[PDB]
Amino acid sequence: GVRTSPTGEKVTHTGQVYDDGDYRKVRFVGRQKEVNENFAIDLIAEQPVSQVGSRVISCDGGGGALGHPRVYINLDKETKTGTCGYCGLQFRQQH
Amino acid sequence: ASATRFIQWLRNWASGRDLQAKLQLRYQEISKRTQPPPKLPVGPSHKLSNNYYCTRDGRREAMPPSIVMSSQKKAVSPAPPIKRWELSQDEPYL
Amino acid sequence: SNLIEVFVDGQSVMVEPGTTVLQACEKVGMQIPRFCYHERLSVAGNCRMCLVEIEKAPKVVAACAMPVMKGWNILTNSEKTKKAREGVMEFLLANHPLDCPICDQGGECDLQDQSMMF
Amino acid sequence: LKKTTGLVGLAVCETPHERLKILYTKILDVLGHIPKNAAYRKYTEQITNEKLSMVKAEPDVKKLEERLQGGQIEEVILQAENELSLARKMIQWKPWEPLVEEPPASQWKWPI
Amino acid sequence: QLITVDEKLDITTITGVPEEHIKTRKARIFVPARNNMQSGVNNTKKWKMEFDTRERWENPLMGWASTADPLSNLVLTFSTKEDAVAFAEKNGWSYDVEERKVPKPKSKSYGANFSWNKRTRVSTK
Amino acid sequence: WDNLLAVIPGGSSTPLIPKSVCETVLMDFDALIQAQTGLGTAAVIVMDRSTDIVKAIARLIEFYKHESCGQCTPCREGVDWMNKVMARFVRGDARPAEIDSLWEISKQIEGHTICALGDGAAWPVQGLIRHFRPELEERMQQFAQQHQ
Numbered sequence: 125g126v127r128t129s130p131t132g133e134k135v136t137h138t139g140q141v142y143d144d145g146d147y148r149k150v151r152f153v154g155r156q157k158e159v160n161e162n163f164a165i166d167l168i169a170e171q172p173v174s175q176v177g178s179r180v181i182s183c184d185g186g187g188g189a190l191g192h193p194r195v196y197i198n199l200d201k202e203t204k205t206g207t208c209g210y211c212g213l214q215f216r217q218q219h
Numbered sequence: 220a221s222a223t224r225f226i227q228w229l230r231n232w233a234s235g236r237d238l239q240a241k242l243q244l245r246y247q248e249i250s251k252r253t254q255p256p257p258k259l260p261v262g263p264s265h266k267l268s269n270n271y272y273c274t275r276d277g278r279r280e281a282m283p284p285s286i287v288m289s290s291q292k293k294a295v296s297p298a299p300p301i302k303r304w305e306l307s308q309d310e311p312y313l
Numbered sequence: 314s315n316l317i318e319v320f321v322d323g324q325s326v327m328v329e330p331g332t333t334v335l336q337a338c339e340k341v342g343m344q345i346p347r348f349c350y351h352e353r354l355s356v357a358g359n360c361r362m363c364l365v366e367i368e369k370a371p372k373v374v375a376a377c378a379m380p381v382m383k384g385w386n387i388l389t390n391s392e393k394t395k396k397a398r399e400g401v402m403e404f405l406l407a408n409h410p411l412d413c414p415i416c417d418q419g420g421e422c423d424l425q426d427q428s429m430m431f
Numbered sequence: 432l433k434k435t436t437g438l439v440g441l442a443v444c445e446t447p448h449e450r451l452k453i454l455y456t457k458i459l460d461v462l463g464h465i466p467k468n469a470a471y472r473k474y475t476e477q478i479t480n481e482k483l484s485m486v487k488a489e490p491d492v493k494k495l496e497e498r499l500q501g502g503q504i505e506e507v508i509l510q511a512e513n514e515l516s517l518a519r520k521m522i523q524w525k526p527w528e529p530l531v532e533e534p535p536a537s538q539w540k541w542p543i
Numbered sequence: 544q545l546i547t548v549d550e551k552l553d554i555t556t557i558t559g560v561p562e563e564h565i566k567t568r569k570a571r572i573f574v575p576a577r578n579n580m581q582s583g584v585n586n587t588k589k590w591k592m593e594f595d596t597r598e599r600w601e602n603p604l605m606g607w608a609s610t611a612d613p614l615s616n617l618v619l620t621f622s623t624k625e626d627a628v629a630f631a632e633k634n635g636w637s638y639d640v641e642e643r644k645v646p647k648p649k650s651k652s653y654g655a656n657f658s659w660n661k662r663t664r665v666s667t668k
Numbered sequence: 669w670d671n672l673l674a675v676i677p678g679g680s681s682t683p684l685i686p687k688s689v690c691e692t693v694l695m696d697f698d699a700l701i702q703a704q705t706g707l708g709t710a711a712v713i714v715m716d717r718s719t720d721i722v723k724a725i726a727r728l729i730e731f732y733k734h735e736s737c738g739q740c741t742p743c744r745e746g747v748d749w750m751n752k753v754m755a756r757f758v759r760g761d762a763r764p765a766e767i768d769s770l771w772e773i774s775k776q777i778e779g780h781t782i783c784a785l786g787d788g789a790a791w792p793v794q795g796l797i798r799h800f801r802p803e804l805e806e807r808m809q810q811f812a813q814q815h816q
């Protein structure tokens with residue numbers, strides 16, 4: 125989430141923030157630092173894991189041709205979930 | 220479209236044309252800005268058989284130039300003389 | 314001395330005995346498609362991407378594993394050779410995942426590049 | 432006689448048959464100074480005689496243009512003037528001589 | 544008619560190149576090494592000429608990579624080593640040439656995988 | 669005899685033959701080659717008109733899919749590919765244009781593999797398509813109408 129550096133500058137979702145003594149923060153004086161407040165890493169982690177009854181599932185991101193290329197995910201390991209490498213949705217095998 | 224009769228007659232007379240039939244401002248005759256979705260056709264290479272790419276590969280049929288003479292009978296022209304053009308029957312003289 | 318004569322697309326080349334079809338083609342500057350073959354590893358012959366037609370021979374040979382024979386004419390651009398590559402590439406891509414955008418190999422992938430060419 | 436050739440700057444010729452006989456004859460005389468086996472002499476004599484035969488055979492200017500197949504008759508006269516000028520220049524150039532020089536080893540090799 | 548000019552070709556004063564980028568530069572004439580990530584050898588056919596790498600620094604505004612070197616991207620392709628050297632001589636550049644590296648011919652034998660008594664016998668296929 | 673539908677004359681690898689061919693065909697290497705099949709191991713598998721010819725061959729492709737060693741590409745991927753297509757042909761959940769696609773796929777396996785298992789998995793498919801194409805196209809038509 126959007127932390128604030130001890131100086132008070134907001135930290136971005138890439139972890140960027142000018143340190144103390146970095147002159148470049150002068151560019152924000154009398155203006156502002158543009159920071160997107162909707163961190164994708166946090167939002168994706170709020171999606172529930174989907175239970176499926178097969179060893180392999182396919183993900184296209186939803187929306188058909190509006191999603192991402194269709195990939196097939198293996199769910200054989202039970203120590204973890206299967207994640208989509210495009211959209212980050214998680215899948216688990218139902219027993 | 221909203222011009223009164225008298226102004227329509229005045230400007231029609233002034234231009235010599237019937238302007239109302241060919242108005243330059245667009246009204247309801249143009250298409251709707253929301254259209255039904257298309258369903259576009261597919262090209263001829265969309266086949267499940269008899270479709271080997273090597274038989275329809277235009278690039279690989281291009282050859283290096285044919286050497287006619289290298290520095291290593293009737294006269295000819297580059298092509299036959301161009302046939303003479305004909306006057307339009309539509310309207311030969313503007 | 315002991316060199317035998319073979320032909321690549323009708324061009325004569327003299328090679329030592331034991332030279333493979335794939336190596337004979339390199340001597341005229343052609344590179345046969347490959348996946349399993351590597352010049353510093355033992356010959357495998359499993360990917361089948363190096364299949365090439367020998368003139369007046371019904372069956373295509375694995376160019377990486379087949380020793381040449383005197384007088385062989387290796388048709389490396391024949392319709393039979395090209396259709397063998399298309400079939401093999403098609404089997405390679407059947408189960409391959411649609412990953413190129415997220416795959417680090419993208420842009421320097423032999424599967425991408427030989428799919429484009431062959 | 433036509434009112435115009437239709438091409439700006441190309442005037443109508445009063446006597447096209449007479450003008451074409453004079454020009455082709457001049458071309459042939461100039462060709463007589465080129466070496467006999469020079470291809471330019473052989474081809475140009477060949478085509479020049481063919482046009483000259485049409486000029487004599489066909490007296491109708493409209494019909495003559497149909498045979499010569501080279502545009503207006505005034506375009507044919509201009510072309511004969513161009514050929515006559517070329518023949519005179521070819522005598523001094525002498526392009527029937529052997530190639531002046533071979534190009535470097537791979538001057539014309541593409542791609543490099 | 545022709546004249547005899549008995550000098551080595553030298554065009555550095557009619558190319559417009561600044562003094563700094565003729566005599567401080569070091570051209571490298573080489574055949575590029577095969578990208579070891581791929582087996583294709585089609586990018587190892589021609590000779591290349593490239594110049595020495597100079598400083599790249601971070602733009603203060605955006606962090607982009609800035610350059611003051613006009614020759615940073617200049618790459619020339621040549622058919623042979625001699626052509627590349629001749630181009631560098633007449634342009635006044637100091638150059639280093641590197642011999643072409645051709646792969647050695649290997650003795651390959653599928654049957655060696657199943658040797659009766661040699662170590663080349665494989666334990667898996 | 670009139671109940672005879674098809675015979676596989678030399679084990680699963682050899683292509684089937686219909687009843688008409690079985691009327692006169694001799695059991696030897698050369699005669700069965702003329703009938704576009706083969707003597708093979710001379711294991712005669714007999715199918716009567718109550719058989720589901722498509723399913724019978726599909727189970728044979730499933731056998732070869734279970735047996736491919738996986739070493740070489742055309743059989744590792746191709747035989748499994750044919751198995752999926754054949755499974756769909758059993759239900760008619762396919763289009764007729766896929767039959768000629770299946771024929772082309774088998775020809776890509778045949779003669780391009782390390783061993784003859786790949787050929788042995790392509791011939792049964794070729795035999796079915798060669799002699800029972802109306803049965804395949806008739807099942808696809810049947811499936812299509814029940815799904816409208």
Ligand code: SF4
Binds near residue numbers: 737738781782787
């Ligand atoms: S064709 Fe033979 S070698 Fe190749 S995968 Fe099939 S069984 Fe293995």
Ligand code: FES
Binds near residue numbers: 348358359360361364
């Ligand atoms: S390169 Fe794999 S079979 Fe020859």
Ligand SMILES: [Zn+2]
Binds near residue numbers: 209212
């Ligand atoms: Zn996804």
